[PDB]
């Protein structure tokens, strides 16, 4: 529920192996990043980290915000959050993205590389209509309810 | 270390910014010295 674990650690980490040391929830950004990518930030409602975001409009006194969501209202994908300022870094749907994204905790075992994915109401990827997203790996379990997956999103589809 | 000093020569951008901060401080110091509020 946070970019970095709230509870501290009791152990030092072992910096010996170099394989499979990236499947952590603190891994922000994307695995393959282009220097010609358009990057935005927005006020964040809730915790839309590693989730699809949509524009949220209030009464009018305050500016718009971004909240975890998908479906027909998908605006982009959140890749980073600064907790002090509550700023959510968002990559628009018109820009290509490849990274680890939150996966729905239902049939996550059935997710295999090369499977089509679409965003749900809560900004979580699920196995399939309107968004071009394909899983490049299998579900990796970080917590009893938290599952992440390597996926590539390359715009909307007809 | 202020832009108001003609002899000042910024070696790098960081020193240039510091001179700006000093220059702003000296100006507000100067402003209060010259300020004379109207009583009544």
């Amino acid at each position: 529920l946070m970019k970095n674990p709230q509870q501290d650690s009791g152990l030092l980490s072992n910096s010996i192996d170099f394989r499979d040391q990236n499947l952590i929830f603190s891994n922000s950004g994307g695995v393959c990043t282009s220097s010609k990518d358009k990057i935005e930030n927005y006020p964040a409602k809730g915790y839309p980290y590693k989730r699809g975001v949509k524009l949220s409009f209030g009464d009018g006194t305050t500016e718009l915000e971004v909240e975890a969501g998908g479906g027909d209202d998908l605006y982009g994908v959140c890749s980073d959050i600064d907790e002090f300022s509550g700023m959510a870094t968002v990559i628009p749907i018109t820009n290509n993205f490849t990274g680890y994204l939150t996966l729905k905790k239902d049939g996550q075992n059935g997710v295999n590389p090369g499977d089509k994915l679409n965003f749900n109401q809560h900004g979580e990827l699920e196995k399939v209509k309107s968004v071009n997203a394909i899983a490049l790996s299998k579900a990796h379990k970080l917590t009893e309810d938290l599952f992440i997956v390597l996926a590539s999103v390359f715009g909307n589809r007809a | 270390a202020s832009l108001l000093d003609s002899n000042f020569v910024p070696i790098n951008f960081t020193e240039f910014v510091q001179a700006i901060s000093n220059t702003y401080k000296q100006r507000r110091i100067q402003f209060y010295e010259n300020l004379k509020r109207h009583k009544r």
Binding site: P43, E65 | L3, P10, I11, E15, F16, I20, Y24, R37
Partner: protein, 313 residues
Amino acid sequence: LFDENYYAKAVANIIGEVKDPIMYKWFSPDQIEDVDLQMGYQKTVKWDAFLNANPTTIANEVNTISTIGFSSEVVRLNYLKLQYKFRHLKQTSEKFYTSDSYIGDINNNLLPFAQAYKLASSEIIKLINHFVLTGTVSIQKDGKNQKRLLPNMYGLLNMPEQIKEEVASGDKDKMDKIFEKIEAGLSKLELGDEFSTPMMVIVDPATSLKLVKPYAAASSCEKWEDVLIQTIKAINNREDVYIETSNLLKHKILIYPLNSELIKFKPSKYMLPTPNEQVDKDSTDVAHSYIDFVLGGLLATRKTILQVNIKQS
């Protein structure tokens, strides 16, 4: 650096033409103290004592005594860093736009870097002055669509736990009713030990014109302003009472002391606009530059500011 970078030289030669902010009139020289922090927070601790119950009579033998409690309070001040970008003309491209009496493409709204920088700096300083007085950041005249800000970021007009007075709409033009509310607020003010200090009053222009009329059968040699100054001089130990007018306010009267102990302004040393080192360049003649500024740093004791709002229908 000046030899290598033209924009650095241009800013230094033009920084002296930018006018000082008007907020400085609102604070005493000692009330402002700069801090070295771009983004983050600063914390302070205050200690209070209180009496739990009535004192205990020491007669004969007794074991249960009334207690005196203590409490700690931690105050945090937040700081924020904001940036703006503006387009301008490349330095080497100025000679092809110089004209008889101006430089820049009028048809396309393009300017030299120097003039663009000065105009943007003035606009930002206007924005900063609005925030300090009113505690909000917005560009609409209605004041909506405000930028969401971090907590512990307040201005003089939105500071919580202060005395707030509202003048009824039907008495909007009745100076006696307005002065009545001011006195009620003045009574509820709690200066305590820090009373022998100068006081500051800020009013909107409509209020100021009402003040200058003679006091009311009208009196002679006595204006509503003079009566108000005497009333404030009653509670500040006959100290100086300053009155300023600001177009930023609208039907609002702000009264607060000018003592560093009660209200202190600790702005960042980088609050005022500063050029960024990153300059976008392209094959065309259009370049972009960035300006940074820092907001926050106002600290005030509770129930030490009087805020009078004159409701307009």
